[PDB]
DNA sequence: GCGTCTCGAATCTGATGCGTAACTTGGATGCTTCGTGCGT
């Protein structure tokens, strides 16, 4: 899998819609997934409407949308892929905290896309870049493009465990917000400020925003136990 | 067209209570599509 639109024909196996124009000009990328639209490929002109708030994330100004993206842009597809992890095998739901911990500590090997909506409904799937290697996971949370490294997540979890192994009252070394919205997101808490060594503080201050967002779900007083998410592509196909 | 002496002294020079009370102690919002009508 190479493009976000590749999930349609590879895990949803949906044939293209009808009434679609056929490109008969010089190739140009899809305005959504940057996929080339060569001669003979089925496309459709852009008709996003006045409620499209993702003009900044458009891959190109070609005003053309491939059929895979047209399938992806359906309301049933948007709602189904709000908290979805699309691997080669199928589509899983990472909405639960345990699923997030499993994904960010024991990721699947194959290429996969990670989606997470920050609101009721958002355009995600055609914006998420593919994660080619599980060591450098690219996560699209709403409008933010996050890079999550599972090794850094594990190291931060170990740092917290060493910090709070003895004290009965568990305290978060770093202030984290699940929405990545608080003005104190990523700042060191007091307990971590005078209970962590210089190296651990330096490591905590030098984590990517995506790692802070992930730890905002995985790092708590009682760490969630990782579990495999349930397959969802059947539900999405049935509702489509 | 008069002046000296005299031209103070010794206390006392605060004391007592009161020297807070009740409420308030946040709220709401930051999605986009699909279908069905309704104005140019
Ligand atoms: Zn596309």
PDB file of C-alpha atoms (C1' of nucleotides) and ligand atoms in Angstrom:
ATOM      1  CA  UNK A   1       0.000   0.000   0.000  1.00  0.00           C
ATOM      2  CA  UNK A   2       1.382   3.315  -1.212  1.00  0.00           C
ATOM      3  CA  UNK A   3      -1.410   5.904  -1.071  1.00  0.00           C
ATOM      4  CA  UNK A   4      -4.282   6.549   1.346  1.00  0.00           C
ATOM      5  CA  UNK A   5      -6.777   5.686  -1.403  1.00  0.00           C
ATOM      6  CA  UNK A   6      -5.213   2.225  -1.774  1.00  0.00           C
ATOM      7  CA  UNK A   7      -7.264   1.027   1.204  1.00  0.00           C
ATOM      8  CA  UNK A   8     -10.451   0.953  -0.890  1.00  0.00           C
ATOM      9  CA  UNK A   9      -9.579  -1.744  -3.426  1.00  0.00           C
ATOM     10  CA  UNK A  10      -7.237  -3.616  -1.056  1.00  0.00           C
ATOM     11  CA  UNK A  11      -9.219  -4.017   2.180  1.00  0.00           C
ATOM     12  CA  UNK A  12     -12.722  -2.854   1.190  1.00  0.00           C
ATOM     13  CA  UNK A  13     -12.598  -4.300  -2.355  1.00  0.00           C
ATOM     14  CA  UNK A  14     -15.233  -1.837  -3.546  1.00  0.00           C
ATOM     15  CA  UNK A  15     -15.617  -1.501  -7.329  1.00  0.00           C
ATOM     16  CA  UNK A  16     -15.613   2.085  -8.629  1.00  0.00           C
ATOM     17  CA  UNK A  17     -18.876   3.996  -8.794  1.00  0.00           C
ATOM     18  CA  UNK A  18     -20.804   4.645 -12.003  1.00  0.00           C
ATOM     19  CA  UNK A  19     -21.034   7.809 -14.056  1.00  0.00           C
ATOM     20  CA  UNK A  20     -17.367   8.660 -13.512  1.00  0.00           C
ATOM     21  CA  UNK A  21     -15.404  10.541 -16.146  1.00  0.00           C
ATOM     22  CA  UNK A  22     -12.275   9.005 -17.657  1.00  0.00           C
ATOM     23  CA  UNK A  23      -9.052  11.008 -17.654  1.00  0.00           C
ATOM     24  CA  UNK A  24      -7.756  11.658 -21.177  1.00  0.00           C
ATOM     25  CA  UNK A  25      -5.003  14.219 -20.615  1.00  0.00           C
ATOM     26  CA  UNK A  26      -1.569  14.595 -19.056  1.00  0.00           C
ATOM     27  CA  UNK A  27      -1.358  12.785 -15.693  1.00  0.00           C
ATOM     28  CA  UNK A  28      -2.045  14.854 -12.588  1.00  0.00           C
ATOM     29  CA  UNK A  29      -2.277  13.948  -8.920  1.00  0.00           C
ATOM     30  CA  UNK A  30      -5.504  13.510  -6.997  1.00  0.00           C
ATOM     31  CA  UNK A  31      -6.426  16.607  -5.014  1.00  0.00           C
ATOM     32  CA  UNK A  32      -6.914  14.398  -1.933  1.00  0.00           C
ATOM     33  CA  UNK A  33      -4.423  11.498  -1.875  1.00  0.00           C
ATOM     34  CA  UNK A  34      -1.868  12.839  -4.418  1.00  0.00           C
ATOM     35  CA  UNK A  35      -2.341   9.649  -6.451  1.00  0.00           C
ATOM     36  CA  UNK A  36      -1.519  10.110 -10.153  1.00  0.00           C
ATOM     37  CA  UNK A  37      -4.538  10.050 -12.456  1.00  0.00           C
ATOM     38  CA  UNK A  38      -3.164   8.785 -15.760  1.00  0.00           C
ATOM     39  CA  UNK A  39      -5.027   8.174 -19.005  1.00  0.00           C
ATOM     40  CA  UNK A  40      -7.802   5.619 -18.669  1.00  0.00           C
ATOM     41  CA  UNK A  41      -8.197   6.095 -14.916  1.00  0.00           C
ATOM     42  CA  UNK A  42     -11.656   6.918 -13.594  1.00  0.00           C
ATOM     43  CA  UNK A  43     -11.883  10.315 -11.899  1.00  0.00           C
ATOM     44  CA  UNK A  44     -14.488  12.949 -11.061  1.00  0.00           C
ATOM     45  CA  UNK A  45     -14.201  16.746 -10.844  1.00  0.00           C
ATOM     46  CA  UNK A  46     -14.030  18.306  -7.403  1.00  0.00           C
ATOM     47  CA  UNK A  47     -17.440  19.152  -5.911  1.00  0.00           C
ATOM     48  CA  UNK A  48     -16.488  19.318  -2.239  1.00  0.00           C
ATOM     49  CA  UNK A  49     -18.968  22.068  -1.337  1.00  0.00           C
ATOM     50  CA  UNK A  50     -18.918  25.009   1.046  1.00  0.00           C
ATOM     51  CA  UNK A  51     -18.570  22.812   4.160  1.00  0.00           C
ATOM     52  CA  UNK A  52     -15.140  21.454   3.171  1.00  0.00           C
ATOM     53  CA  UNK A  53     -12.679  22.834   5.730  1.00  0.00           C
ATOM     54  CA  UNK A  54      -9.594  20.951   4.497  1.00  0.00           C
ATOM     55  CA  UNK A  55      -8.487  23.038   1.531  1.00  0.00           C
ATOM     56  CA  UNK A  56      -5.109  23.413   3.243  1.00  0.00           C
ATOM     57  CA  UNK A  57      -4.534  19.650   3.144  1.00  0.00           C
ATOM     58  CA  UNK A  58      -5.317  19.243  -0.559  1.00  0.00           C
ATOM     59  CA  UNK A  59      -2.426  17.484  -2.258  1.00  0.00           C
ATOM     60  CA  UNK A  60      -2.789  19.380  -5.538  1.00  0.00           C
ATOM     61  CA  UNK A  61      -4.855  22.055  -7.269  1.00  0.00           C
ATOM     62  CA  UNK A  62      -5.927  19.707 -10.079  1.00  0.00           C
ATOM     63  CA  UNK A  63      -9.584  19.757  -8.930  1.00  0.00           C
ATOM     64  CA  UNK A  64      -9.792  16.043  -9.761  1.00  0.00           C
ATOM     65  CA  UNK A  65     -10.730  13.220  -7.395  1.00  0.00           C
ATOM     66  CA  UNK A  66     -10.059   9.550  -8.063  1.00  0.00           C
ATOM     67  CA  UNK A  67     -12.810   6.993  -7.536  1.00  0.00           C
ATOM     68  CA  UNK A  68     -11.117   5.498  -4.470  1.00  0.00           C
ATOM     69  CA  UNK A  69     -11.222   8.892  -2.770  1.00  0.00           C
ATOM     70  CA  UNK A  70     -14.841   9.336  -3.870  1.00  0.00           C
ATOM     71  CA  UNK A  71     -15.594   6.118  -1.998  1.00  0.00           C
ATOM     72  CA  UNK A  72     -13.516   7.372   0.943  1.00  0.00           C
ATOM     73  CA  UNK A  73     -15.414  10.687   1.018  1.00  0.00           C
ATOM     74  CA  UNK A  74     -18.785   9.051   1.703  1.00  0.00           C
ATOM     75  CA  UNK A  75     -20.381   9.849   5.051  1.00  0.00           C
ATOM     76  CA  UNK A  76     -20.495   6.169   6.008  1.00  0.00           C
ATOM     77  CA  UNK A  77     -16.775   5.940   5.248  1.00  0.00           C
ATOM     78  CA  UNK A  78     -15.926   9.117   7.175  1.00  0.00           C
ATOM     79  CA  UNK A  79     -17.847   8.000  10.262  1.00  0.00           C
ATOM     80  CA  UNK A  80     -16.461   4.467  10.068  1.00  0.00           C
ATOM     81  CA  UNK A  81     -12.858   5.682   9.778  1.00  0.00           C
ATOM     82  CA  UNK A  82     -12.944   8.190  12.644  1.00  0.00           C
ATOM     83  CA  UNK A  83     -10.810   6.021  14.969  1.00  0.00           C
ATOM     84  CA  UNK A  84      -9.677   3.396  12.477  1.00  0.00           C
ATOM     85  CA  UNK A  85      -6.388   1.565  11.943  1.00  0.00           C
ATOM     86  CA  UNK A  86      -6.308   0.197   8.392  1.00  0.00           C
ATOM     87  CA  UNK A  87      -3.705  -2.511   7.878  1.00  0.00           C
ATOM     88  CA  UNK A  88      -3.342  -4.884   4.930  1.00  0.00           C
ATOM     89  CA  UNK A  89      -5.502  -7.522   6.620  1.00  0.00           C
ATOM     90  CA  UNK A  90      -8.411  -5.260   7.529  1.00  0.00           C
ATOM     91  CA  UNK A  91      -9.687  -2.212   9.383  1.00  0.00           C
ATOM     92  CA  UNK A  92      -9.425  -2.101  13.176  1.00  0.00           C
ATOM     93  CA  UNK A  93     -10.757   0.402  15.704  1.00  0.00           C
ATOM     94  CA  UNK A  94      -8.269   2.053  18.057  1.00  0.00           C
ATOM     95  CA  UNK A  95     -10.886   4.090  19.952  1.00  0.00           C
ATOM     96  CA  UNK A  96     -10.188   2.332  23.253  1.00  0.00           C
ATOM     97  CA  UNK A  97      -7.134   3.151  25.358  1.00  0.00           C
ATOM     98  CA  UNK A  98      -5.958  -0.468  25.398  1.00  0.00           C
ATOM     99  CA  UNK A  99      -6.052  -0.532  21.596  1.00  0.00           C
ATOM    100  CA  UNK A 100      -3.971   2.656  21.492  1.00  0.00           C
ATOM    101  CA  UNK A 101      -1.426   1.175  23.900  1.00  0.00           C
ATOM    102  CA  UNK A 102      -1.200  -1.995  21.815  1.00  0.00           C
ATOM    103  CA  UNK A 103      -0.765  -0.006  18.599  1.00  0.00           C
ATOM    104  CA  UNK A 104       1.888   2.331  20.012  1.00  0.00           C
ATOM    105  CA  UNK A 105       3.841  -0.382  21.837  1.00  0.00           C
ATOM    106  CA  UNK A 106       3.296  -3.539  19.734  1.00  0.00           C
ATOM    107  CA  UNK A 107       2.376  -2.280  16.255  1.00  0.00           C
ATOM    108  CA  UNK A 108       1.417  -4.549  13.361  1.00  0.00           C
ATOM    109  CA  UNK A 109       4.311  -5.280  10.986  1.00  0.00           C
ATOM    110  CA  UNK A 110       2.640  -4.611   7.633  1.00  0.00           C
ATOM    111  CA  UNK A 111       2.108  -1.088   6.263  1.00  0.00           C
ATOM    112  CA  UNK A 112      -0.868   0.568   7.919  1.00  0.00           C
ATOM    113  CA  UNK A 113      -2.702   3.868   8.254  1.00  0.00           C
ATOM    114  CA  UNK A 114      -3.627   5.349  11.637  1.00  0.00           C
ATOM    115  CA  UNK A 115      -6.615   7.679  11.958  1.00  0.00           C
ATOM    116  CA  UNK A 116      -8.101   9.539  14.898  1.00  0.00           C
ATOM    117  CA  UNK A 117     -10.747  12.254  14.758  1.00  0.00           C
ATOM    118  CA  UNK A 118     -10.582  15.244  17.083  1.00  0.00           C
ATOM    119  CA  UNK A 119     -14.262  16.100  16.537  1.00  0.00           C
ATOM    120  CA  UNK A 120     -17.600  14.588  15.533  1.00  0.00           C
ATOM    121  CA  UNK A 121     -16.601  13.955  11.913  1.00  0.00           C
ATOM    122  CA  UNK A 122     -13.503  14.844   9.919  1.00  0.00           C
ATOM    123  CA  UNK A 123     -11.806  14.053   6.628  1.00  0.00           C
ATOM    124  CA  UNK A 124      -8.963  11.786   7.724  1.00  0.00           C
ATOM    125  CA  UNK A 125      -8.290   8.786   5.503  1.00  0.00           C
ATOM    126  CA  UNK A 126      -7.094  10.663   2.419  1.00  0.00           C
ATOM    127  CA  UNK A 127      -4.755  12.787   4.566  1.00  0.00           C
ATOM    128  CA  UNK A 128      -2.978  10.046   6.535  1.00  0.00           C
ATOM    129  CA  UNK A 129       0.392   9.051   5.055  1.00  0.00           C
ATOM    130  CA  UNK A 130       1.186   5.355   5.077  1.00  0.00           C
ATOM    131  CA  UNK A 131       3.375   3.994   7.878  1.00  0.00           C
ATOM    132  CA  UNK A 132       6.021   2.033   5.989  1.00  0.00           C
ATOM    133  CA  UNK A 133       7.984   0.993   9.100  1.00  0.00           C
ATOM    134  CA  UNK A 134       6.407   0.372  12.500  1.00  0.00           C
ATOM    135  CA  UNK A 135       9.334   2.086  14.237  1.00  0.00           C
ATOM    136  CA  UNK A 136       8.253   5.469  12.793  1.00  0.00           C
ATOM    137  CA  UNK A 137       4.453   5.549  12.964  1.00  0.00           C
ATOM    138  CA  UNK A 138       2.638   8.462  11.321  1.00  0.00           C
ATOM    139  CA  UNK A 139      -0.680   9.218  13.038  1.00  0.00           C
ATOM    140  CA  UNK A 140      -3.275  11.697  11.773  1.00  0.00           C
ATOM    141  CA  UNK A 141      -5.195  13.094  14.747  1.00  0.00           C
ATOM    142  CA  UNK A 142      -7.750  15.520  13.355  1.00  0.00           C
ATOM    143  CA  UNK A 143      -5.787  18.346  11.745  1.00  0.00           C
ATOM    144  CA  UNK A 144      -2.409  17.429  13.271  1.00  0.00           C
ATOM    145  CA  UNK A 145       0.030  15.107  11.508  1.00  0.00           C
ATOM    146  CA  UNK A 146       1.774  13.202  14.294  1.00  0.00           C
ATOM    147  CA  UNK A 147       4.901  11.049  14.285  1.00  0.00           C
ATOM    148  CA  UNK A 148       4.918   8.405  17.024  1.00  0.00           C
ATOM    149  CA  UNK A 149       7.951   6.240  17.762  1.00  0.00           C
ATOM    150  CA  UNK A 150       7.070   3.155  19.850  1.00  0.00           C
ATOM    151  CA  UNK A 151      10.572   2.995  21.338  1.00  0.00           C
ATOM    152  CA  UNK A 152      10.189   6.511  22.751  1.00  0.00           C
ATOM    153  CA  UNK A 153       6.749   5.612  24.119  1.00  0.00           C
ATOM    154  CA  UNK A 154       8.199   2.552  25.850  1.00  0.00           C
ATOM    155  CA  UNK A 155      11.098   4.574  27.256  1.00  0.00           C
ATOM    156  CA  UNK A 156       8.769   7.253  28.643  1.00  0.00           C
ATOM    157  CA  UNK A 157       6.536   4.590  30.191  1.00  0.00           C
ATOM    158  CA  UNK A 158       9.607   3.023  31.805  1.00  0.00           C
ATOM    159  CA  UNK A 159      10.685   6.452  33.074  1.00  0.00           C
ATOM    160  CA  UNK A 160       7.287   6.944  34.700  1.00  0.00           C
ATOM    161  CA  UNK A 161       7.375   3.440  36.192  1.00  0.00           C
ATOM    162  CA  UNK A 162      10.821   4.005  37.718  1.00  0.00           C
ATOM    163  CA  UNK A 163       9.722   7.407  39.010  1.00  0.00           C
ATOM    164  CA  UNK A 164       6.548   6.063  40.644  1.00  0.00           C
ATOM    165  CA  UNK A 165       7.547   2.508  41.608  1.00  0.00           C
ATOM    166  CA  UNK A 166       7.803   3.271  45.326  1.00  0.00           C
ATOM    167  CA  UNK A 167       5.459   6.158  46.092  1.00  0.00           C
ATOM    168  CA  UNK A 168       1.870   5.085  46.706  1.00  0.00           C
ATOM    169  CA  UNK A 169       0.350   8.214  45.124  1.00  0.00           C
ATOM    170  CA  UNK A 170       1.070   7.883  41.408  1.00  0.00           C
ATOM    171  CA  UNK A 171       2.008  11.199  39.787  1.00  0.00           C
ATOM    172  CA  UNK A 172       2.422  11.937  36.091  1.00  0.00           C
ATOM    173  CA  UNK A 173       6.000  13.042  35.289  1.00  0.00           C
ATOM    174  CA  UNK A 174       4.775  15.134  32.337  1.00  0.00           C
ATOM    175  CA  UNK A 175       1.469  16.937  31.894  1.00  0.00           C
ATOM    176  CA  UNK A 176      -0.407  15.450  28.942  1.00  0.00           C
ATOM    177  CA  UNK A 177      -3.784  16.158  27.346  1.00  0.00           C
ATOM    178  CA  UNK A 178      -5.663  13.578  25.290  1.00  0.00           C
ATOM    179  CA  UNK A 179      -6.982  16.377  23.069  1.00  0.00           C
ATOM    180  CA  UNK A 180      -3.509  17.972  22.761  1.00  0.00           C
ATOM    181  CA  UNK A 181      -5.246  21.269  23.501  1.00  0.00           C
ATOM    182  CA  UNK A 182      -4.193  22.413  26.978  1.00  0.00           C
ATOM    183  CA  UNK A 183      -1.598  25.170  27.238  1.00  0.00           C
ATOM    184  CA  UNK A 184       0.370  22.892  29.576  1.00  0.00           C
ATOM    185  CA  UNK A 185       0.533  19.981  27.128  1.00  0.00           C
ATOM    186  CA  UNK A 186       4.015  18.484  27.153  1.00  0.00           C
ATOM    187  CA  UNK A 187       5.231  20.536  30.112  1.00  0.00           C
ATOM    188  CA  UNK A 188       6.931  18.804  33.020  1.00  0.00           C
ATOM    189  CA  UNK A 189       4.783  18.460  36.123  1.00  0.00           C
ATOM    190  CA  UNK A 190       6.178  19.373  39.525  1.00  0.00           C
ATOM    191  CA  UNK A 191       6.603  15.783  40.678  1.00  0.00           C
ATOM    192  CA  UNK A 192       8.567  14.967  37.533  1.00  0.00           C
ATOM    193  CA  UNK A 193      10.472  18.229  37.889  1.00  0.00           C
ATOM    194  CA  UNK A 194      11.923  17.405  41.330  1.00  0.00           C
ATOM    195  CA  UNK A 195      11.766  13.610  41.041  1.00  0.00           C
ATOM    196  CA  UNK A 196      13.544  12.936  37.711  1.00  0.00           C
ATOM    197  CA  UNK A 197      17.202  13.039  36.737  1.00  0.00           C
ATOM    198  CA  UNK A 198      18.606  15.474  34.184  1.00  0.00           C
ATOM    199  CA  UNK A 199      18.765  12.817  31.463  1.00  0.00           C
ATOM    200  CA  UNK A 200      15.150  11.733  31.991  1.00  0.00           C
ATOM    201  CA  UNK A 201      13.950  15.347  32.021  1.00  0.00           C
ATOM    202  CA  UNK A 202      15.879  16.003  28.806  1.00  0.00           C
ATOM    203  CA  UNK A 203      14.299  12.920  27.231  1.00  0.00           C
ATOM    204  CA  UNK A 204      10.807  13.987  28.306  1.00  0.00           C
ATOM    205  CA  UNK A 205      11.270  17.488  26.892  1.00  0.00           C
ATOM    206  CA  UNK A 206      12.584  16.073  23.583  1.00  0.00           C
ATOM    207  CA  UNK A 207       9.650  13.866  22.559  1.00  0.00           C
ATOM    208  CA  UNK A 208       7.589  14.522  19.454  1.00  0.00           C
ATOM    209  CA  UNK A 209       4.093  16.022  19.777  1.00  0.00           C
ATOM    210  CA  UNK A 210       2.670  12.717  18.576  1.00  0.00           C
ATOM    211  CA  UNK A 211       4.448  10.911  21.397  1.00  0.00           C
ATOM    212  CA  UNK A 212       2.971  13.341  23.925  1.00  0.00           C
ATOM    213  CA  UNK A 213      -0.481  12.733  22.447  1.00  0.00           C
ATOM    214  CA  UNK A 214      -0.027   8.951  22.597  1.00  0.00           C
ATOM    215  CA  UNK A 215       1.283   9.026  26.167  1.00  0.00           C
ATOM    216  CA  UNK A 216      -1.762  11.116  27.072  1.00  0.00           C
ATOM    217  CA  UNK A 217      -3.712   7.888  26.436  1.00  0.00           C
ATOM    218  CA  UNK A 218      -1.245   5.203  27.515  1.00  0.00           C
ATOM    219  CA  UNK A 219       0.326   6.819  30.605  1.00  0.00           C
ATOM    220  CA  UNK A 220      -1.871   6.765  33.716  1.00  0.00           C
ATOM    221  CA  UNK A 221      -1.823   5.519  37.296  1.00  0.00           C
ATOM    222  CA  UNK A 222      -3.062   2.131  36.032  1.00  0.00           C
ATOM    223  CA  UNK A 223      -1.532   1.594  32.601  1.00  0.00           C
ATOM    224  CA  UNK A 224      -3.996  -0.055  30.184  1.00  0.00           C
ATOM    225  CA  UNK A 225      -3.079  -3.585  29.202  1.00  0.00           C
ATOM    226  CA  UNK A 226      -2.531  -3.821  25.426  1.00  0.00           C
ATOM    227  CA  UNK A 227      -5.155  -5.772  23.510  1.00  0.00           C
ATOM    228  CA  UNK A 228      -5.825  -6.462  19.855  1.00  0.00           C
ATOM    229  CA  UNK A 229      -8.598  -4.261  18.418  1.00  0.00           C
ATOM    230  CA  UNK A 230     -11.574  -5.881  16.744  1.00  0.00           C
ATOM    231  CA  UNK A 231     -11.935  -5.901  12.971  1.00  0.00           C
ATOM    232  CA  UNK A 232     -14.404  -3.329  11.658  1.00  0.00           C
ATOM    233  CA  UNK A 233     -14.302  -3.508   7.837  1.00  0.00           C
ATOM    234  CA  UNK A 234     -17.315  -5.837   7.868  1.00  0.00           C
ATOM    235  CA  UNK A 235     -19.360  -3.245   9.772  1.00  0.00           C
ATOM    236  CA  UNK A 236     -18.288  -0.416   7.459  1.00  0.00           C
ATOM    237  CA  UNK A 237     -19.060  -2.482   4.361  1.00  0.00           C
ATOM    238  CA  UNK A 238     -22.473  -3.454   5.744  1.00  0.00           C
ATOM    239  CA  UNK A 239     -23.337   0.165   6.542  1.00  0.00           C
ATOM    240  CA  UNK A 240     -22.153   1.246   3.079  1.00  0.00           C
TER     241      UNK A 240
ATOM    242  C1'  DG B   1      14.566 111.683  82.539  1.00  0.00           C
ATOM    243  C1'  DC B   2      15.561 104.521  88.001  1.00  0.00           C
ATOM    244  C1'  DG B   3      16.914  98.702  89.020  1.00  0.00           C
ATOM    245  C1'  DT B   4      18.510  93.903  91.466  1.00  0.00           C
ATOM    246  C1'  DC B   5      16.500  89.597  94.018  1.00  0.00           C
ATOM    247  C1'  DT B   6      12.619  86.241  92.027  1.00  0.00           C
ATOM    248  C1'  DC B   7      12.793  84.219  86.579  1.00  0.00           C
ATOM    249  C1'  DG B   8       9.251  76.939  90.591  1.00  0.00           C
ATOM    250  C1'  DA B   9       9.330  72.138  92.043  1.00  0.00           C
ATOM    251  C1'  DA B  10       7.114  66.714  91.864  1.00  0.00           C
ATOM    252  C1'  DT B  11       4.278  63.589  90.458  1.00  0.00           C
ATOM    253  C1'  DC B  12       1.187  61.409  86.814  1.00  0.00           C
ATOM    254  C1'  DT B  13       3.941  59.529  81.758  1.00  0.00           C
ATOM    255  C1'  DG B  14      -3.879  54.251  81.338  1.00  0.00           C
ATOM    256  C1'  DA B  15      -6.878  50.340  81.566  1.00  0.00           C
ATOM    257  C1'  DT B  16     -10.574  46.384  79.133  1.00  0.00           C
ATOM    258  C1'  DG B  17     -13.082  43.971  75.070  1.00  0.00           C
ATOM    259  C1'  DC B  18     -13.474  43.461  70.075  1.00  0.00           C
ATOM    260  C1'  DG B  19      -9.268  41.310  67.598  1.00  0.00           C
ATOM    261  C1'  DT B  20     -16.023  38.828  61.603  1.00  0.00           C
ATOM    262  C1'  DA B  21     -20.037  36.499  59.402  1.00  0.00           C
ATOM    263  C1'  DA B  22     -22.691  34.130  54.834  1.00  0.00           C
ATOM    264  C1'  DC B  23     -22.712  33.119  49.768  1.00  0.00           C
ATOM    265  C1'  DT B  24     -19.927  32.640  45.340  1.00  0.00           C
ATOM    266  C1'  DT B  25     -16.879  27.785  44.805  1.00  0.00           C
ATOM    267  C1'  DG B  26     -18.799  29.016  35.701  1.00  0.00           C
ATOM    268  C1'  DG B  27     -21.078  28.520  31.462  1.00  0.00           C
ATOM    269  C1'  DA B  28     -21.131  27.264  25.540  1.00  0.00           C
ATOM    270  C1'  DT B  29     -18.854  26.579  21.475  1.00  0.00           C
ATOM    271  C1'  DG B  30     -15.256  25.435  17.566  1.00  0.00           C
ATOM    272  C1'  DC B  31     -18.571  18.382  12.103  1.00  0.00           C
ATOM    273  C1'  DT B  32     -19.457  17.338   7.540  1.00  0.00           C
ATOM    274  C1'  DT B  33     -22.475  14.734   4.615  1.00  0.00           C
ATOM    275  C1'  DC B  34     -26.917  13.405   2.640  1.00  0.00           C
ATOM    276  C1'  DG B  35     -31.569  14.122   1.438  1.00  0.00           C
ATOM    277  C1'  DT B  36     -35.413  17.143   0.487  1.00  0.00           C
ATOM    278  C1'  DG B  37     -37.313  21.239  -0.662  1.00  0.00           C
ATOM    279  C1'  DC B  38     -37.115  26.132  -1.846  1.00  0.00           C
ATOM    280  C1'  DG B  39     -35.610  30.426  -3.913  1.00  0.00           C
ATOM    281  C1'  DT B  40     -33.466  32.644  -8.377  1.00  0.00           C
TER     282       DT B  40
HETATM  283 ZN1  LIG C   1      -7.496  10.227  -4.434  1.00  0.00          ZN
END
